[PDB]
Amino acid sequence: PHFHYSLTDEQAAELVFKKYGVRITPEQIAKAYAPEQRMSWKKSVEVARFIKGMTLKQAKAWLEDVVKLKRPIPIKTFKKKQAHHATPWEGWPVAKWPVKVAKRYLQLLENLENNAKFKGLDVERLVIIHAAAHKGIKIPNIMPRAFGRATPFNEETVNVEIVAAELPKEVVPKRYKLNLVKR
RNA sequence: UAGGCAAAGCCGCCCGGUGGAUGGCUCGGCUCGGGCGCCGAAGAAGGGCGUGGCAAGCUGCGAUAAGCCCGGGGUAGCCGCAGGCAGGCUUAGAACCCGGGAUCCCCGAAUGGGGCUUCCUGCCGGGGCCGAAUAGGCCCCGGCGCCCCGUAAGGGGCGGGAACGCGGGGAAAGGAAACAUCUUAGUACCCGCAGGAAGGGAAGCCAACAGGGACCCCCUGAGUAGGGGCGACCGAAAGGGGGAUA
RNA sequence: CCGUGAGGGAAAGCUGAAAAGAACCCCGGAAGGGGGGUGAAAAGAGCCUGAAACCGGGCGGCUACAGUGGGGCAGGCCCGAAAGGAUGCCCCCUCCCGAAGGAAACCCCGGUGACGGGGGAGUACGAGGGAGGGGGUCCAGGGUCUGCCCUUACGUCUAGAAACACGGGCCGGGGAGUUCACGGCCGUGGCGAGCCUAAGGGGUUCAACCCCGGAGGCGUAGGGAAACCGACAGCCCGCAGCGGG
RNA sequence: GCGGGGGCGGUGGGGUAAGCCUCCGCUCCGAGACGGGAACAACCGAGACCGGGGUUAAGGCCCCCAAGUGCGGGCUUAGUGU
RNA sequence: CGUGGGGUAGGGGGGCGCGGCCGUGGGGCAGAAGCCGGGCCGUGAGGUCCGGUGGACCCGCGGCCGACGAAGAUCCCGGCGGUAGUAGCAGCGAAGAGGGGUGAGAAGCCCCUCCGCCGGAAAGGACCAGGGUUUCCUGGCAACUUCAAUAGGCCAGGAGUUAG
RNA sequence: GGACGGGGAACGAGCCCCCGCGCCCGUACCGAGAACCGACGCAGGUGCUCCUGGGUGAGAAGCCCAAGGCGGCUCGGGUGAC
RNA sequence: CGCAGGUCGCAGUGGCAAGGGGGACCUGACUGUUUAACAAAAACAUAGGUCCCCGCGAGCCCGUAAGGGUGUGUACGGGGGC
RNA sequence: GCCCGGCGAACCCACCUCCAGGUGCACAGUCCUGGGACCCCCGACGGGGCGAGAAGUCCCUAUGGAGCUUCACAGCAGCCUG
RNA sequence: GACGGGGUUGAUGGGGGGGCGGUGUAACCCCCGAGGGUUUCCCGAGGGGAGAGCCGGCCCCUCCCAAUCGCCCGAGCGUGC
Numbered sequence A: 001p002h003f004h005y006s007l008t009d010e011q012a013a014e015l016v017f018k019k020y021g022v023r024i025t026p027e028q029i030a031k032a033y034a035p036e037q038r039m040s041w042k043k044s045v046e047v048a049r050f051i052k053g054m055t056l057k058q059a060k061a062w063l064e065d066v067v068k069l070k071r072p073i074p075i076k077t078f079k080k081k082q083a084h085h086a087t088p089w090e091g092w093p094v095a096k097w098p099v100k101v102a103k104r105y106l107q108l109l110e111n112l113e114n115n116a117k118f119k120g121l122d123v124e125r126l127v128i129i130h131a132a133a134h135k136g137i138k139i140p141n142i143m144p145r146a147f148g149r150a151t152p153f154n155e156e157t158v159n160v161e162i163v164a165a166e167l168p169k170e171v172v173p174k175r176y177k178l179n180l181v182k183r
Numbered sequence B: 001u002a003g004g005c006a007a008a009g010c011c012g013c014c015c016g017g018u019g020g021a022u023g024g025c026u027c028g029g030c031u032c033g034g035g036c037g038c039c040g041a042a043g044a045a046g047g048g049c050g051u052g053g054c055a056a057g058c059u060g061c062g063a064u065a066a067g068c069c070c071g072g073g074g075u076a077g078c079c080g081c082a083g084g085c086a087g088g089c090u091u092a093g094a095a096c097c098c099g100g101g102a103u104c105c106c107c108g109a110a111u112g113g114g115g116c117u118u119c120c121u122g123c124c125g126g127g128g129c130c131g132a133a134u135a136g137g138c139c140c141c142g143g144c145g146c147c148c149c150g151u152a153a154g155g156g157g158c159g160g161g162a163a164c165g166c167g168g169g170g171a172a173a174g175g176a177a178a179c180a181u182c183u184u185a186g187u188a189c190c191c192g193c194a195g196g197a198a199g200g201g202a203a204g205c206c207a208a209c210a211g212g213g214a215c216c217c218c219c220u221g222a223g224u225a226g227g228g229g230c231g232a233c234c235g236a237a238a239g240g241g242g243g244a245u246a
Numbered sequence C: 001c002c003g004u005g006a007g008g009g010a011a012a013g014c015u016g017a018a019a020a021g022a023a024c025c026c027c028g029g030a031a032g033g034g035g036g037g038u039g040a041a042a043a044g045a046g047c048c049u050g051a052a053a054c055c056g057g058g059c060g061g062c063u064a065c066a067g068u069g070g071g072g073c074a075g076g077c078c079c080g081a082a083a084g085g086a087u088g089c090c091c092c093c094u095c096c097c098g099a100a101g102g103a104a105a106c107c108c109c110g111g112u113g114a115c116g117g118g119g120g121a122g123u124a125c126g127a128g129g130g131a132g133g134g135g136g137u138c139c140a141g142g143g144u145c146u147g148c149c150c151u152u153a154c155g156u157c158u159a160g161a162a163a164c165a166c167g168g169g170c171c172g173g174g175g176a177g178u179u180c181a182c183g184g185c186c187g188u189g190g191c192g193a194g195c196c197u198a199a200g201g202g203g204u205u206c207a208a209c210c211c212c213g214g215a216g217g218c219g220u221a222g223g224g225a226a227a228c229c230g231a232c233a234g235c236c237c238g239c240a241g242c243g244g245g
Numbered sequence D: 001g002c003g004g005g006g007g008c009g010g011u012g013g014g015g016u017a018a019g020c021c022u023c024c025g026c027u028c029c030g031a032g033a034c035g036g037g038a039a040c041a042a043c044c045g046a047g048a049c050c051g052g053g054g055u056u057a058a059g060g061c062c063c064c065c066a067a068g069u070g071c072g073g074g075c076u077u078a079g080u081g082u
Numbered sequence E: 001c002g003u004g005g006g007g008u009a010g011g012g013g014g015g016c017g018c019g020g021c022c023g024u025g026g027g028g029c030a031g032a033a034g035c036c037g038g039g040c041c042g043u044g045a046g047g048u049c050c051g052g053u054g055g056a057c058c059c060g061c062g063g064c065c066g067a068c069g070a071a072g073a074u075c076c077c078g079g080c081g082g083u084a085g086u087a088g089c090a091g092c093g094a095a096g097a098g099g100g101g102u103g104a105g106a107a108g109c110c111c112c113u114c115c116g117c118c119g120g121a122a123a124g125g126a127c128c129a130g131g132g133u134u135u136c137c138u139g140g141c142a143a144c145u146u147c148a149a150u151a152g153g154c155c156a157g158g159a160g161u162u163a164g
Numbered sequence F: 001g002g003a004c005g006g007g008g009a010a011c012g013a014g015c016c017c018c019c020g021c022g023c024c025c026g027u028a029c030c031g032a033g034a035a036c037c038g039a040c041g042c043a044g045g046u047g048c049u050c051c052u053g054g055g056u057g058a059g060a061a062g063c064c065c066a067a068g069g070c071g072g073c074u075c076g077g078g079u080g081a082c
Numbered sequence G: 001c002g003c004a005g006g007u008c009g010c011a012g013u014g015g016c017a018a019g020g021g022g023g024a025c026c027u028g029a030c031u032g033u034u035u036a037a038c039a040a041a042a043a044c045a046u047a048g049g050u051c052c053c054c055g056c057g058a059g060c061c062c063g064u065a066a067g068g069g070u071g072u073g074u075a076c077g078g079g080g081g082c
Numbered sequence H: 001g002c003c004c005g006g007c008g009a010a011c012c013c014a015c016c017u018c019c020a021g022g023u024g025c026a027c028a029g030u031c032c033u034g035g036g037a038c039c040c041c042c043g044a045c046g047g048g049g050c051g052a053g054a055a056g057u058c059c060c061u062a063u064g065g066a067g068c069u070u071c072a073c074a075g076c077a078g079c080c081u082g
Numbered sequence I: 001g002a003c004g005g006g007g008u009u010g011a012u013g014g015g016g017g018g019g020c021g022g023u024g025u026a027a028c029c030c031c032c033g034a035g036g037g038u039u040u041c042c043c044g045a046g047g048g049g050a051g052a053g054c055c056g057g058c059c060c061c062u063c064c065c066a067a068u069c070g071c072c073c074g075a076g077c078g079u080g081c
């Protein structure tokens, strides 16, 4: 089947003007979708909340270090009974290293970078404007328990959509903005 | 002081994901009315196994296996559900429908005898094969159930069918505001036996001194007579009107 | 499919008019993504519409010195196209009328006094109802937050429920005074000392409808176990109504 | 509907007593909003169609909280009491 | 006109909605039902209109009839949450490591070397019942295996059981 | 299998050589800490039902090692608080 | 299987394997059986003792009946109690 | 156990609750009067939430059962007798 | 999580040297060894001398190795009383 995105290209361009002050066309927008990923859904949402606003090269750099267990991902929402760590950012002590989620996101970023190149956009000025993770369909399964009863043991898939826009280079950020309180 | 100025979190709207409500639809159900009504030793119903070029299920069919023959209708397509890939059939008249035939594995009333595996196995008679042989062995085909009728020849019964029909055996729960007689109920259910219906049917009748005139079924008589811890409750018949009429 | 067995037993419908069932290009190990196509419309085979619960993002309001929900009033920020008003709404000013109610200053009388009385004065004012002038621009309505005032989840039994009384995680769909027979009664309709046909029969445009069918049932007379017997306009009071004063 | 209950009164009668048991009467709650009582079915005031204005009831008038740090006389030293 | 205006159980009187039927009048591909938000009307049950979505039916009025109205029954069926990225994937006397190869991808698949466990056996040889193709070969990884996988009793295709 | 009897033929063996026939059904694999039953790839049960080398040893005990098998009682790494 | 000599350790059945012992009371003689899934006992059974119904067409028991068990038995026996 | 990587449930759930003293269906998170608290996250425990599980088996009631007893009310076999 | 110290102008961890310490005297070599036989140059439990050997989650010294490369946060302005 076909999946839709949470915002249109027209809605994307308006958000690009609001957040950066420049006007762009739908030509300057490239998309990518990753439907029904077999990975953790609570951590997929956190990765989407982090890479939003980075350039496509910066997000690939950070996600590569997550797979090498060298840089963490902040956990702001699904944080119950989660440990505190020393972090490279400022303003949040809950971090993780989701390696399976970071690898699927790297494939999505690779597909996104190809679609920008195919359209003729410049990858160096491609800034991720919209990213969101959605719970997909369940692949149901049960676990046998004690006393003859069985309980659900499900594989909840994840749907990932990403939208980037090619901005003028004088407004693209040149370093990571890692102030999670202000972010 | 307040704003730029934001954590986690809360509320509302919009978009998306999940979900399958709602609405529309309907080759399905349900109810009612009319019809029609038995099949089986000429081996049934039911079941198993098998059968399609690619086919697992359903449907059909049975080693002649989604089929074979004949006739009537039907003329141009067809090879089921079932929208694919091939190859065919068909104008020498197919597919399709209707009537008549053929085939119809194993188990099955199953009926030569067994059957702890729907499979196995015996005797007689005929045929065939291995074999030097007419020996011996192996295989195919036919007959071989019980109880009966008949001089014999020969013939009958057996099992099945949604409900209905006839004979016999026969509760309890519940009700009675407890409960035993009682009711429930001659019911549920069981055993046996028929038909397309069955059973009933042709005055040792009913009546009341006036007369009806076999039987069954419908309306009524009637919850009347009567039965009954005369309680709960149960409960006609004659007579009259009809269907039909022998 | 479940049970050794006697037996028990589900879930599960929808592409489009036509596959026209998505060519071709980039990426991906692949599911698949992007671009590009078909189609009136993706309606895309996980296929009509596609709600809520739920989850993600965007937007609006709040957010780390203040105890939460619901209502009223006031304000901040945001929306306020249509379907509502804009002949509106608010401010000021001016005029008039004005219910119940109703001052003050100041003068006079009294009390130690808090205060009372005469006048001022039924006055200024007063819910609301009319008219006009100028100014402004949205007003009504909605979301969210703040301030002040008010405020003890729901359903249930109970004398008594916010109860430490019991039931519900949430949302969608489903979910409970029916029918017959008999009896009482009511509201109407037909006929009326009579009323109605039942079964059934004929016809029909065929379960409808028209016509026939009075058997029977109830009423017209009661008393008595039964045999048996079997009934009023005479008088008075008097509502309505009528006639007389 | 045939489970009642609260207050007051009959030293009701019983009981050590009981928010206790069982009678008699008015009223209220149940089935009655609202103001006061610090909260509080039945104690005091009072009986609610909706909106507004006014005046009072119970009770209150130093602050919380509308209205008096109101007036005269006397008592209390215990923060008794409010 | 009323020194009329509380009200549970209960009695009485009127109205709204849902599905169909008998009539009557209409709308709809220039967009019906349904769905999301909003305005207006009505004390109210509700009605009606606007914008979006949708794609073929539907509605006003009179009469009649019902399988006719839900917030609840430790209600039934389905879906989906917080709990929560939490519990568990310890215990029952074995366990892995290095190098190479395959592969998109390798701690885990194949090979060698080292290390360990059983050895009258949770473990080697045989085999009954039961199971019924799980056996062998090839290929694969959408699902299954408490993690992974290129592995597999899994999936797809083909093959296999010989008696005096 | 042997003996003991009766009957029959003119042939004839349990010895040697040579010739022919032997149908039907089962036969794969697990046989269990993953192929059976227990809803499961379940620490139970069925079946340890039968069999198995060396050293020590009373020993079919335990411990070590053969033949033979296994690292699949199907998560991995770090830390070294309570 | 024994004897002699020498010699080391904290420890010589050095690991593995592998009884703590004694006195007395209650109670059931003993071995045995038992509430699968909260009771293993002093409960049940037991050998031994004794009593009763019975000479077989018996006694006791089963079956609607046909008939059956005890009984292919016989008082040193069958059945029934304690 | 804790931390990291991977898989990934359930119980329970009207909403969801800082403390003191009162009041109230007499044992309040929600009412009254007070005392406090910057918010968020982690680990642990088991005082509270009359914590969760289970329509209390204890007690009573019902003109409710079942099983057992007999000197209950009745009845039926069986045996004896005419 | 945090906290503390160092981070090349450096002794922060390791290597090497030294100190202190634990155990108990390694290998080799020499002597003895109950008794036996290849009579005595052999076997033999074991004992003595010299040498200890092994080891340190401690201290000192010494830049031989590594404390690198890098990645982020961060006030700045207006308003009124």
Ligand SMILES: [Mg+2]
Residues within 6 Å of the ligand: A038, A039, A040, A041, A155, A156
């Ligand atoms: Mg997952």
Ligand SMILES: [Mg+2]
Residues within 6 Å of the ligand: A148, F038
């Ligand atoms: Mg089990």
Ligand SMILES: [Mg+2]
Residues within 6 Å of the ligand: none
């Ligand atoms: Mg925030």
Ligand SMILES: [Mg+2]
Residues within 6 Å of the ligand: none
């Ligand atoms: Mg058949």
Ligand SMILES: [Mg+2]
Residues within 6 Å of the ligand: B110
């Ligand atoms: Mg036969």
Ligand SMILES: [Mg+2]
Residues within 6 Å of the ligand: none
């Ligand atoms: Mg009944």
Ligand SMILES: [Mg+2]
Residues within 6 Å of the ligand: B175, B176
């Ligand atoms: Mg009764």
Ligand SMILES: [Mg+2]
Residues within 6 Å of the ligand: none
């Ligand atoms: Mg009874």
Ligand SMILES: [Mg+2]
Residues within 6 Å of the ligand: none
């Ligand atoms: Mg018959």
Ligand SMILES: [Mg+2]
Residues within 6 Å of the ligand: B198
């Ligand atoms: Mg007949």
Ligand SMILES: [Mg+2]
Residues within 6 Å of the ligand: none
């Ligand atoms: Mg007849």
Ligand SMILES: [Mg+2]
Residues within 6 Å of the ligand: none
């Ligand atoms: Mg009767």
Ligand SMILES: [Mg+2]
Residues within 6 Å of the ligand: C050
């Ligand atoms: Mg759809």
Ligand SMILES: [Mg+2]
Residues within 6 Å of the ligand: C081
């Ligand atoms: Mg507007």
Ligand SMILES: [Mg+2]
Residues within 6 Å of the ligand: C084
């Ligand atoms: Mg308008």
Ligand SMILES: [Mg+2]
Residues within 6 Å of the ligand: C157, C158
């Ligand atoms: Mg109660």
